Amino acid sequence: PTQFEERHLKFLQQLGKGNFGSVEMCRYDPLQDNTGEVVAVKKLQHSTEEHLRDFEREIEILKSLQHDNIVKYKGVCYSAGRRNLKLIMEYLPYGSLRDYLQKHKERIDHIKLLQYTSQICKGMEYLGTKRYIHRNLATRNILVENENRVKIGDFGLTKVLPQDKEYYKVKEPGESPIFWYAPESLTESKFSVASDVWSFGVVLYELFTYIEKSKSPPAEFMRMIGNDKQGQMIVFHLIELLKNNGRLPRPDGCPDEIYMIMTECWNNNVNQRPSFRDLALRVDQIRD
Numbered sequence: 001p002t003q004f005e006e007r008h009l010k011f012l013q014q015l016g017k018g019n020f021g022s023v024e025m026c027r028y029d030p031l032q033d034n035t036g037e038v039v040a041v042k043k044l045q046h047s048t049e050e051h052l053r054d055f056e057r058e059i060e061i062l063k064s065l066q067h068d069n070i071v072k073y074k075g076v077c078y079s080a081g082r083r084n085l086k087l088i089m090e091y092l093p094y095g096s097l098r099d100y101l102q103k104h105k106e107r108i109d110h111i112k113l114l115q116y117t118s119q120i121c122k123g124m125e126y127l128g129t130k131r132y133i134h135r136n137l138a139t140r141n142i143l144v145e146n147e148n149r150v151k152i153g154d155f156g157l158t159k160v161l162p163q164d165k166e167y168y169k170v171k172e173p174g175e176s177p178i179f180w181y182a183p184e185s186l187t188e189s190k191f192s193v194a195s196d197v198w199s200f201g202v203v204l205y206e207l208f209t210y211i212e213k214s215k216s217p218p219a220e221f222m223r224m225i226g227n228d229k230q231g232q233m234i235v236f237h238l239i240e241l242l243k244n245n246g247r248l249p250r251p252d253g254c255p256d257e258i259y260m261i262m263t264e265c266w267n268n269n270v271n272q273r274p275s276f277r278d279l280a281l282r283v284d285q286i287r288d
């Protein structure tokens with residue numbers, strides 16, 4: 001199957017809701033009775049013209065991706081008399097890695113964190129070969145199939161690199177996850193493979209903090225900057241902080257070797273940052 005029908009595909013559960021739209025658990029039942037495959041359906045809320053243009057680009061990006069650590073594309077569903085667009089993805093039962101690590105839990109140590117770390121790296125290597133820049137790497141955007149496998153999701157902010165340059169300038173945003181952003185992504189709005197490496201360093205940081213309330217990237221940066229400051233002054237302070245080796249501290253219980261990987265990812269020099277292939281091999285060699 002590649003095209004999913006509106007008359008079938010029955011609602012089961014609401015998975016996620018935000019300003020972008022809503023992702024919902026559904027069962028595609030063509031026969032149908034009750035025996036059918038469970039799939040995740042993504043739609044839009046507060047929809048305009050530009051959001052459909054970006055959503056259609058998001059579908060095409062996800063369609064071109066076929067990897068064990070990337071959320072699988074199933075198809076598309078045209079609803080409301082073929083006047084609305086919906087993305088069909090596979091369903092992963094254990095939700096986001098952010099919720100999975102906070103609640104499943106005192107069962108994950110460094111070597112299991114590195115297993116998830118390695119899988120994120122391998123998925124990012126696949127995205128590099130297709131010249132895609134994720135731009136939104138976070139533990140909340142990584143989905144969990146089972147205790148042994150995690151998959152990269154949320155490709156809404158993913159941009160395709162031009163044939164001319166190795167970077168992509170994005171001016172549109174307005175609201176952006178600035179605490180995962182690279183210095184050049186903040187100052188010059190430049191996004192590349194190396195900016196994803198920077199963001200991955202923050203993802204690796206999130207994992208070894210076990211997402212404890214006070215140890216989160218936004219909470220730690222605002223502690224160094226001053227949690228009393230609001231609007232742009234946060235960004236001005238963050239830029240000056242990152243320019244002069246201001247970094248997220250080593251998590252409680254995190255080995256020195258792992259924090260070295262974080263700091264290497266957090267390099268102000270763009271070209272000095274390690275590739276995702278270098279990271280995946282280093283992480284796997286530490287595992288055994």
Ligand SMILES: CC(=O)Nc1ccc(-c2ccnc(Nc3ccc(N4CCOCC4)cc3)n2)cc1
Nearest residue numbers: 015016023040089090091092093095096153154
């Ligand atoms: C912005 C965006 O792209 N969001 C998003 C959210 C999701 C998924 C997705 C894809 C495949 N499977 C799942 N499964 C899943 C199952 C349970 C939860 N939760 C468990 C209960 O608590 C709420 C979340 C979340 C996701 N989600 C894809 C794109």
